[PDB]
Amino acid sequence: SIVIASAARTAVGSFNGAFANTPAHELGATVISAVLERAGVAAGEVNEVILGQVLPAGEGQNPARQAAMKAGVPQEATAWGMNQLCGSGLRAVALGMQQIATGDASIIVAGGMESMSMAPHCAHLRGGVKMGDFKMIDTMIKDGLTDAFYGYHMGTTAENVAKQWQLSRDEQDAFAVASQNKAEAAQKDGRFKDEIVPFIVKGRKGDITVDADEYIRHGATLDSMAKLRPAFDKEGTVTAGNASGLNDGAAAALLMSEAEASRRGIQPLGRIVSWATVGVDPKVMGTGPIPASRKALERAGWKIGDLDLVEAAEAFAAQACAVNKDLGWDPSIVNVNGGAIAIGHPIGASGARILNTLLFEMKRRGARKGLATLCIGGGMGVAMCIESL
Amino acid sequence: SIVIASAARTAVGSFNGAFANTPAHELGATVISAVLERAGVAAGEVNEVILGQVLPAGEGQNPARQAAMKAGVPQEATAWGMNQLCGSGLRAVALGMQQIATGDASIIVAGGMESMSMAPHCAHLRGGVKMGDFKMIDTMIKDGLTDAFYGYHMGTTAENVAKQWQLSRDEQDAFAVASQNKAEAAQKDGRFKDEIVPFIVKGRKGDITVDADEYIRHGATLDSMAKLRPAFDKEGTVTAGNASGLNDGAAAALLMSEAEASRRGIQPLGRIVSWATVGVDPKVMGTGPIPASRKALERAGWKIGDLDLVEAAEAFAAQACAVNKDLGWDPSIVNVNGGAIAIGHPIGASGARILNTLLFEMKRRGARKGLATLCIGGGMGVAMCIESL
Amino acid sequence: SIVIASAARTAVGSFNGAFANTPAHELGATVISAVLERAGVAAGEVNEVILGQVLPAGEGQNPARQAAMKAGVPQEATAWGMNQLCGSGLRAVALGMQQIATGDASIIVAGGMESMSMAPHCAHLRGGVKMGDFKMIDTMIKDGLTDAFYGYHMGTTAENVAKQWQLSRDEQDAFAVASQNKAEAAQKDGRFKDEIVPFIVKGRKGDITVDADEYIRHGATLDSMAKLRPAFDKEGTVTAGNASGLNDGAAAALLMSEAEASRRGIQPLGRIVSWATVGVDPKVMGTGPIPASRKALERAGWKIGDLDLVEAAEAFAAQACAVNKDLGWDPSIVNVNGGAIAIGHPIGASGARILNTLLFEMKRRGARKGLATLCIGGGMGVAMCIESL
Amino acid sequence: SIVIASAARTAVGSFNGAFANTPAHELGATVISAVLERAGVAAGEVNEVILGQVLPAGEGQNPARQAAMKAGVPQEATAWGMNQLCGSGLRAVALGMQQIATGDASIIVAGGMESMSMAPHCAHLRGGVKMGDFKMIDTMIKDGLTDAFYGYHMGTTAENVAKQWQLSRDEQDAFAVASQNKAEAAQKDGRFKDEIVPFIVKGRKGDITVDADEYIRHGATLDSMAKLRPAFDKEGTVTAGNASGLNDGAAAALLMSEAEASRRGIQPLGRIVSWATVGVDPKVMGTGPIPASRKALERAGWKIGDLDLVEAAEAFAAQACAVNKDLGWDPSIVNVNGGAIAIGHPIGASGARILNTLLFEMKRRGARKGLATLCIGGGMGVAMCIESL
């Protein structure tokens, strides 16, 4: 019933990098405009914008609405944001699909956006501090990256998974270098061009056009990777090199019914066949994609062997490894263009980011059946199955 | 099709009052346990928790999940939060309904939660401040209450509406006093007892049980109301007395199919027959409820005259007056137990809070057809139609 | 040769009390006017104002200039502040004396002022905080009360003195009670009436005359004293009850040669016959007064027995007892009207504050030779000998 | 009878440059050790260290005693800071001279130190902030650079003087260019080598040695000067180019009796023949050096024409010209190696910084009489006369 008419994403910016001072909703507005243009659909026609966003503090009322309004979506339309952590960008898409499935809207723009760079530090001060030092809390770390039940970083959950799965530092680094090497090759061959829409960072002393993923290392070496220190555990195995990055970006999709696309003469990027979300132990959250992907497949009536292409989000080499090992899908069809270790990981946006990557590679290679999945802090996974028209 | 098996709310707390240092997820956890207990449904049976929440900064990863885990919802379930401003707690319920209608879940807990007291001040400090003072932003004011497009308070949107609809200060005050007087009578008669679940405020030198709405003023006088100064515009008409408050609380509902409740022998509080959300001009966001309620009724196939009871959220006397004038429903059936001017207005929670009040009043008086609606910052409304079974 | 024509001091306020919102320089201005008025000297005759002050953060350029100008001292005069911690208030008078003695000035106003209540929290943010929590530092504690070499509170240095002089908890409670009793006694006997000059705390909702030492607790008994738990060590001896308080206040003296006073027909509160500052171990900083006292005494060619009146700052019961035991002077002429434990310890002003008490008490009882001394954090002491004329 | 036995200063750092993260007392300790070494005096011989410093917030108890201790001065000695704003560094030396003059001390180290980089932002937060944004105040701007009575920047007092004296933009620019060219020439020709002691910036990623003033622009031209826009007044004359800079550094002098130096075989840098400080209207604070220099010269018995060399702090091209214009001393003997416009102006150290430049230049050219002077925010001036031996 529901198709993805069009998709777009910004380049992913490095932490305090190209988009260091760019509010998330500015990134979202550009991707909203882009999917409308790519589909031949006027902003006037949008019913609702649904944007995942984990870190909106200090951005002002409902950044999803600010994005939609900046893109010229009409005031009569609606907008909201949601948060299921790193599952957000993809969940928003399944949520958008449900609005159409129940007959409550016809045209939805859904995805995610995140500025981890603009995330502020904070403190509750209404009571006052009579005496003594107090903490200014980094919201990115606190609200984005720390498990609320165990008090440790997502990177520690990665350690937990490495131990349970017995994944050596050497195995994790090999994975990491492959991801970098795949992404470099894809960037250089122009495989990210179709999906990226440029973003203009307005500057008094010059406007800069950002249209490439700046986090991707060129010529990353295993030796330099092997050299790194463990980032979360002195005798750990997870490093800055084999973990995903802290990043900025947005990414979205334009949804409507298959019949509606047909009337408009649009050739959709894909049909949404199923999605699923399941929970797992917070301590091993990186394992979420396993039950999530298996449920999505079952809902699709598909076998793992039926898939032609897969984007499994690389939160950490440790967890991506475990996911691939348990699901057992051919690794040669997974993250064919590199993943988050190389490309970066703007949390609320990431699920829509890999959806864009999946859809455009499926189109270019003629892949019929695909799946995107991500792990979720606090212990969850989300997955979505996509079939080509 | 989808019914509300059961519902519950905490007392609504005064700003920096009874829940001054209570994080929202703790209020949510209590309300999740209550809906479960009231339906006879075990926590193990819940598929997903969905909580509207506008101000989660500093609380940690995905407070919805924290609330759910604290209530004993199993790790295999999921949880997410969402943000459609004051519409959130009600939109969360419509979203929960869609999970079931599309066959993606069987049992949902849905509502909202908010601690405006615990909302922090923040600043973006990653780039440093080379020189010059800078602002520590109040997230409640900034992210909750300020219009992102015009830069003025929701109270200014209320002024715009009062000007446009030509509602005197005296008229707004009379509405305000009536709200207070209806709320006091309802409290004293015990009409809020069904819907409220007590919350134990843990204290080092004494736990305190909060089970009454503390913001409700006893013996409110028109003369005291009339002596207040305009709170947003020196020659304005909107005052602290005829505006909603800044408050804390949570409220939820347990959702399942009609056939599911029947299998379980559950007598539902009601059937969700339609909902709607529509946009309007940010400048007069308080008019949100007009097109939303009309759309909801049309979808329900109901005339305005078909309604037996209505809860229209009182963000400001000014806009609540405008809403009633335009829709023309019998004002004697609207907020019969008072509303937000008296009871309070914890943003994320408010939509579920008025849903609770509607359901328990509908049950108590044998009302067949109900509607709940709220205005939303940035120019939106949401409304839901409920029929008794 | 150099005399103190006149002296005055504010009442000493409790922490976040009478002066919770009053900037030190306002308190300075009141005291400057009082010494002029009391000596019958025009402000235009002041060459320079010198004010000790440890916690100026946030008050604007050179608070001593601000105080001087508010007090009426014309623009032609000069002003500056100085910091020798708790010695400041007294040191400033020594410095003032030195201006005249070298023939560089004729008339000085010198003393100290401090608002520990108005001391702000701070952080260095120019380079930015890239990631992670940081601390907002209480300047009162950091710059005021923490030893910069060992990193602990002045309370620990007193604990240090407690264990070296083997002073028992009860032996410090005894000292604490007797100070309180004496303080209450002088107060009710009206012995602080002369030195004190009232301060008017302006206000929107009222004006308040502050003319009483509010930190003095009346009816002090040993019972409550010995029921306090240690303040700096889980099983130490120093407590809130036997250490000085946190307080606001200002105090000052008017200086000029003995000839000048004569020409103006002024009867001086006394003559400064010597002064001294010496250093000691930072760990046992409370001992400071021992060497500075002997130095000043030796410089004046007096013996300890020559003294008729002594003011020895009560930073802590521990250090005060230690100094009194080491010096061997008669415990019945020391802090006759009680000390800082009962009166308050406004760091920057304390040395001038105790100088006032000394001066007015000497005059009242007909004492000939007098001494004021204070210990200083970082390991220093300062002392001054005063003779009646 | 007081002589400057020796002197030293760090290189002056650019704002957030070489010493971006270097606490003032560290620079202070280096300069203290240096003057000890240069004079051949043992640290254990130092009675007191006196350091001017305007922005100490968050550096802990009495940064001056920190410097003295780190520098190796024994706990037995004393130390304190003082604030006469821009004149602090030179006033310190005059105060140390008085210590010896009155026989209270034999050997003093006096000067000043400032880290405008490390100055923090602050907020008074003890009462708490119930709601609303609040200001985090830049202490550098607030306590250092803003007139407490008029609320505007020193740059505005500068305009006042410029308009008062009718000094054209071009004129101020011509002065700016000279000061840079003079400093560049002095730097390259080795003229700063004597006075500067190198400072080692300790660093994880390596140590860096700083021994050159990094703020001096090489090849400054009238062309570049002209292109700059007004820094404070939209139709003003003062720009970043003809105004002094924000900077870090420290400077000091070892003081002793002339007979003591002769006992030691020391050939002092000069004899302090007089000093003076005077007030003026804060609005035109930049005029301060006029009365100060004239009073100093009068106290010295010197005609203006007796001077062989002059250091007159270049707070602004505006006030500098004015001062020079009034006094009428030969311009070719004024700031011969450049001034603060090029070298930098580390507030509390500045007066000791220009004292170093003067002393060392007086020696290499055989100058007999010299004068140093600076303006002071809040409307004061200070000056000192030096005579070679």
Ligand SMILES: CC(C)(COP(=O)(O)OP(=O)(O)OC[C@H]1O[C@@H](n2cnc3c(N)ncnc32)[C@@H](O)[C@@H]1OP(=O)(O)O)[C@@H](O)C(=O)NCCC(=O)NCCS
């Ligand atoms: C004047 C002042 C406000 C400007 O501060 P600032 O703008 O942060 O410093 P900058 O040098 O970066 O000024 C901006 C620009 O002018 C420049 N500039 C300054 N002098 C220049 C020159 N002689 N030639 C060419 N460019 C010059 C640039 O370096 C610069 O360009 P950029 O912004 O692209 O980097 C500041 O230095 C100050 O307040 N000075 C006075 C301090 C004081 O009052 N002390 C006490 C007085 S008694």
Ligand SMILES: CC(C)(COP(=O)(O)OP(=O)(O)OC[C@H]1O[C@@H](n2cnc3c(N)ncnc32)[C@@H](O)[C@H]1OP(=O)(O)O)[C@@H](O)C(=O)NCCC(=O)NCCS
């Ligand atoms: C000692 C010190 C740490 C305590 O400050 P504080 O504990 O925050 O002050 P409080 O308002 O909390 O009062 C302290 C507590 O003991 C009490 N108390 C203190 N003296 C008491 C007495 N004489 N009798 C009965 N109770 C007493 C209580 O009032 C109690 O608070 P409560 O109401 O919760 O029971 C503080 O005053 C200080 O730092 N003193 C030293 C200052 C200094 O070092 N200056 C320079 C010296 S070199």
Ligand SMILES: CC(C)(COP(=O)(O)OP(=O)(O)OC[C@H]1O[C@@H](n2cnc3c(N)ncnc32)[C@H](O)[C@@H]1OP(=O)(O)O)[C@@H](O)C(=O)NCCC(=O)NCCS
């Ligand atoms: C309206 C608002 C600004 C007022 O906040 P506030 O004035 O700071 O809070 P208060 O309740 O303490 O009001 C202050 C005063 O009016 C009084 N007051 C309020 N209602 C009164 C009444 N019905 N009768 C008599 N006095 C009343 C107080 O008791 C009080 O007296 P005081 O100043 O001597 O203490 C604030 O509640 C607000 O922002 N509400 C709107 C929130 C909103 O927009 N939500 C979403 C909309 S889509």
Ligand SMILES: CC(C)(COP(=O)(O)OP(=O)(O)OC[C@H]1O[C@H](n2cnc3c(N)ncnc32)[C@@H](O)[C@@H]1OP(=O)(O)O)[C@@H](O)C(=O)NCCC(=O)NCCS
């Ligand atoms: C792991 C993490 C803490 C590190 O961030 P960071 O400390 O800023 O690391 P950086 O990118 O600045 O790089 C650090 C060092 O290793 C680097 N490095 C990183 N990858 C490298 C590589 N592949 N090869 C060589 N060096 C590499 C260096 O550039 C650097 O050295 P230097 O800066 O001292 O000169 C951070 O990226 C993070 O938290 N990632 C996980 C986020 C996450 O949990 N998201 C969601 C999961 S559900």
Ligand SMILES: [Cl-]
């Ligand atoms: Cl979101």
Ligand SMILES: [K+]
């Ligand atoms: K959000």
Ligand code: NA
């Ligand atoms: Na010093």
